[PDB]
């Protein structure tokens, strides 16, 4: 039984070895390097007195939400530096926040094991709690809106769930990860999502069937971050061994490895530009390094965050990049 | 700017005033982390001080606001969410003295006292808690007295050769918890044998928190 499982794993590894014929770094030699990419701060955003953990971009690319330890979800106006909403929180400890695609709802989650959905287009004028999602035995680490009625959450009890917001209960349960699931991202077609856990594995999931499609085991220690490529066939992954790895769904193997000698700090977040050519990551050495999808070098350096970088996300159209740090400031990099 | 842009800037300044007021209220309040095993007596010490996510307890003693966060409900891996609690005033670590005879009910192969020693070793030597003091509580001291009278301490830990005495065994277990600290200069261990009286239990926390605030004020002034 266990020996048969080891033989099947050996067979899958042999199939992965047989599939690969050419290294991707040899193929990308033809395309030119991007050169130095210099980004200057456009806006300096304030109003947080506590540690920022997460930020989700709006679809219109102007609105953004931010999660902090002051008990506040503060929705901002990126262009005019105004504060659109300020949501008082019941649980101070928050580790994630999501913005709906329609713009109607805002989620948050953390150590209280409760996902709170906040309505923004109410007639009363105050952002109140619409639905409290409960039933997690572990801390919520990431949540993303599929729709105004569906949301996919990652939790600390090794269980990812799909939530019917109108019903208030979970529809599809996803299990199989050894260790808590640190993050998740949604594909553009929204029919599949991939989540990385702390057994150095990232498992592709299907919303409809509910069974695990693929699993990649190219990481040494653990996964803090995961983000899809814009086409929906690739995803770069962030880890604590100072490496970033790119995995192809169709090829079912590791495309590229990102590493550099003096950097030993872990990766908190990764993101992609509009084209997908630029891979932007967040590190623990107070420095954000912009990478290249094909050439695998460093295109730019983002600095100016006093405390450790919690999160980083590139907006929908690609006009701006706002980086989340623990110094209670979000800075917008164009 | 248009009229709606001016009114939006006015709304943003009112939100800035509300956030400044809430931050000034939150900066004064003292945050305390509650740690230990489930059967250590967290509920008992919390209900004494008052008179499955994070249980938050608010109580005020001598014009000082306290936040206590009970993390015992979560069953997840602690290493991934322990970095959130970096900016905390002190660590309240509660264990029971009577745990040495009671074998753990997980594998029935390890004493609970040594599991609590490993728990204190993981908390004290954490990279995120370097200048955060640990407020140690030793629970069930009367049951520890009856248990030490019935059964000697020597059976749980073979190396200890001290005589069967309540005060001697209590001082040795206190020194055994103090020995686990590897950075003694920047990290205090405040040990109190938990009594029935609520006032002494709250007073000990107030004294330890007051000493930590004195240390932090010395850090800010820079004399320390």
């Amino acid at each position, epitope marked *: 039984l266990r020996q048969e499982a080891e033989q099947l794993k050996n067979q899958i590894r042999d199939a992965r070895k047989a599939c690969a014929d050419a290294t991707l770094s040899q193929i990308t030699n033809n395309i030119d390097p991007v050169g130095r990419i210099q980004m200057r701060t456009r806006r300096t955003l304030r109003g947080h007195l506590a540690k920022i953990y997460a930020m989700h971009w709006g679809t219109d690319s102007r609105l953004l939400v931010s999660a902090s330890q002051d008990g506040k979800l503060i929705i901002w106006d990126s262009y005019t530096t105004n504060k659109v909403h300020a949501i008082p929180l019941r649980s101070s400890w928050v580790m994630t926040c999501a913005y709906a695609p329609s713009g109607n709802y805002v989620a948050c989650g953390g150590l209280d094991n409760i996902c709170s959905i906040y309505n923004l287009k109410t007639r009363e004028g*105050n952002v109140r709690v619409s639905r409290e999602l409960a039933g997690h035995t572990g801390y919520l680490s990431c949540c993303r809106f599929l729709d105004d009625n569906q949301i996919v959450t990652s939790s600390g009890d090794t269980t990812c769930a799909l939530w019917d917001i109108e019903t208030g209960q979970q529809t599809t349960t996803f299990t199989g990860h050894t260790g808590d699931v640190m993050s998740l991202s949604l594909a553009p077609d929204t029919r599949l999502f991939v989540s990385g856990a702390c057994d150095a594995s990232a498992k592709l999931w299907d919303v409809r069937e509910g069974m695990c499609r693929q699993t990649f085991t190219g990481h040494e220690s653990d996964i803090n971050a995961i983000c899809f490529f814009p086409n929906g066939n690739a995803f770069a992954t962030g880890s604590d061994d100072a490496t970033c790895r790119l995995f192809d769904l169709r090829a079912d193997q590791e495309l590229m490895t990102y590493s550099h000698d003096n950097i030993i700090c872990g990766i908190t977040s990764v993101s992609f530009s509009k084209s997908g050519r630029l891979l932007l990551a967040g590190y623990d050495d107070f420095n954000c390094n912009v990478w290249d999808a094909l050439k695998a070098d460093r295109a730019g350096v983002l600095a100016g965050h006093d405390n450790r970088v919690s999160c980083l996300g590139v907006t929908d159209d690609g006009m701006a990049v706002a980086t989340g740090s623990w110094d209670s400031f979000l800075k917008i990099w164009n | 700017l*248009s009229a709606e842009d001016k009114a939006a800037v*006015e*709304r943003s300044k009112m939100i800035d005033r509300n956030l400044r007021e809430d931050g000034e209220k939150a900066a004064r309040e003292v945050k305390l982390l509650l740690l230990g095993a489930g059967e250590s007596g967290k509920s008992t010490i919390v209900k004494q001080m008052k008179i499955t996510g994070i249980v938050e307890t608010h109580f005020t003693f001598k014009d000082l606001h306290f936040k206590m966060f009970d993390v015992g409900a979560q069953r997840s891996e602690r290493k991934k969410w322990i970095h959130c609690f970096e900016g905390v005033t002190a660590i309240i670590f509660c264990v029971a003295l009577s745990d040495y005879d009671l074998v753990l009910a997980e594998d029935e192969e390890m004493n609970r006292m040594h599991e609590s020693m490993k728990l204190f070793d993981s908390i004290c030597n954490n990279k995120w808690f370097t200048d955060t003091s640990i407020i140690l509580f030793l629970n069930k001291k009367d049951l520890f007295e009856e248990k030490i009278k019935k059964s000697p301490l020597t059976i749980c830990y073979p190396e200890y050769a001290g005589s069967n005495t309540y005060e001697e065994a209590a001082a040795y277990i206190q020194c055994q918890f103090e020995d686990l600290n590897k950075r003694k200069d920047t990290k205090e261990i405040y040990t109190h044998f938990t009594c029935s009286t609520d006032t002494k239990n709250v007073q000990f926390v107030f004294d330890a928190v007051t000493d930590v605030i004195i240390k932090n004020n010395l850090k800010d002034c820079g004399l320390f």
Partner: single-chain antibody
Amino acid sequence: VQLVESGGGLVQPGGSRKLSCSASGFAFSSFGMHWVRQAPEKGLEWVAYISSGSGTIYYADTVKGRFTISRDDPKNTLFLQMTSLRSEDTAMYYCVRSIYYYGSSPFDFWGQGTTLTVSADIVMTQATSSVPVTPGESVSISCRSSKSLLHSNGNTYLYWFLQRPGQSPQLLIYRMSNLASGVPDRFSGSGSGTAFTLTISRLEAEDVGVYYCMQHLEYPLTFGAGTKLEL
């Protein structure tokens, strides 16, 4: 969400009267408050504005000085103080809540209106006055301005209202690109600076009323004459 006004009746000229509007079902402290007056045989007219937290206060030039506006947030009551009333103040006064942020819909909820009878600048121009229409055909309503409302940020501050006969007016279209919450897809706004067009496909008997075009580019707020439809 409900706003009711009290303090009406007959007022002698030169006297004083203090109105009070009570708010229920919404957070009164977060909305800016407008007063809008309506003559019996003429269109609507703006009176005054107070912001949330009483940060800024605006008046029209014809009503400046005589009228005093205040608000009390713990009591959720809007107060209008009137001193030295004249013969032109015989109008029905409305209370309006208005939140201001990016994507907000101000002028969304209108009060009921209190009757006050006394006994002795961007000019918005309605080209038409009354158009006889039939239920089913498309209805075209045009409004014109004295100043280009296209601001440099891209927003065009023109609001469309419908005042049904015997009922309070409601917002239809705000900022000419967005439909108000609760308004069907039958209404649509189009046009550019100084030339605007309103189109109503699938005409309904409830849609029949008085149509107002309102600018919000600068204070004082000046309204339209009012395009009324009939059957």
